[PDB]
Assembly symmetry: D2
Homo-oligomer: 113 residues x 4
């Protein structure tokens, strides 16, 4: 019930100069049980090493009438650590991110809030 | 040139007049170029008299840690539907979203909405 | 109704056709109401036949730590009426501002 | 190396445990340098043992129309030391502020 489909993209040929790896993904907050009529997108980068991390900023847009569109979108920032990109990650809110990074640049997985 | 996109949309939107929430991502790598960055668009599909996809976006570039404070640009794009621009409105979000769109910069957004929440297609910035 | 705003702007902008960087804050408290929140507009002034102030804004409400993840709204406002004057945006809010030689912005904001 | 800041904050915040909404602006010009940009920080003050100011910010650079699409950076800064005082963020930047009884924020900012 708390898990939702995610899909995204990442730079499958990142710079070799110490730069992180650019990526982003989306969750539409509808599953077979619940629907919040909203979607969040996370835009960020993967930073490998001992303390592998995914540092992001996100936009959460809710479906609204035109009259309420001015307040349709929340903005925030999430940092994820692994429990490379493929794997199970957790953020500071305790949300769980299960992800697979295809060789073609695709991000597929699930998110649980 | 053209880059793959993938994303998600609310496949059972509200019926109270609210728009349909959606989002998608482009990694700016194809087989010809790589900008080492990705943009995510978060927004909603609005139907009716003036169909639009209204978005805010975040463009994150790969950077060193010292430069991570400035890795992300923010902006907003409004998309107008050009193929087909004419619609009765039947088909719900899938029909409303599916097709070719252009934003205020003249970029081209070609997307298919289906399979209960999936968005696929191509993006071409101007 | 009306709220105090204060801000800053680049008092010596490039002359290469670039706009003038600026920003201002409204804390949504006046004598009669308090939404326990503040909006900041970050943007640029573009002078011309039809002068414009193009902005992105962040609206942070005071929240508990538990609700801090959803404390901040983001959006964009475009204002129509160099900087000194009365402007209105696409929601019909009224921005009344004075640009000082020091880079200061002072005025009042009234949201539709 | 310092730049003037001005802003606003909620001078009568909720008493429910909520933080204090605030915002401020820096136009990046002083008497020695001008980056032709402005940053606005929007966020809230959280009192207590370890007080903090948690923010999101927008840095808008003056640009020509063609470059306007990339005019604005977005980020988040967390400051540690009431609001009046000397604060530093996670970059090592220094924020020196005075919170006025009228809801004003006045001070100087120095980026790392
Ligand atoms: O309230 C909704 O509309 C759905 C819940 C979304 C939870 C958000 S997405 C950004 C942030 N990061 C998380 O892990 N959870 C919140
Ligand atoms: O410069 C890059 O790193 C890749 C190109 C980014 C183009 C951006 S994405 C947001 C905005 N909307 C568009 O249609 N184009 C720009
Ligand atoms: O609701 C609040 O917490 C205070 C009113 C906020 C109105 C917002 S500020 C950004 C946007 N631009 C406007 O003119 N109005 C809204
Ligand atoms: O070069 C500029 O355009 C002006 C200096 C910008 C420094 C930025 S403001 C946001 C972030 N937080 C800081 O302490 N420094 C950077």
């Amino acid at each position: 019930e708390s898990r939702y489909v995610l899909t995204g993209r990442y730079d499958s040929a990142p710079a070799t100069d110490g730069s992180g790896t650019a990526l982003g993904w989306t969750v539409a907050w509808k599953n077979n049980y619940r629907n919040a009529h909203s979607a969040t997108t996370w835009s960020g980068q993967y930073v490998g090493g001992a303390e592998a991390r995914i540092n992001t900023q996100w936009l959460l847009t809710s479906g609204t009438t035109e009259a309420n569109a001015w307040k349709s979108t929340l903005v925030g920032h999430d940092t994820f650590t692994k429990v490379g990109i493929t794997g199970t990650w957790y953020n500071q809110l305790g949300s769980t991110f299960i992800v697979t990074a295809g060789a073609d640049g695709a991000l597929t997985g699930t998110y649980e809030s």
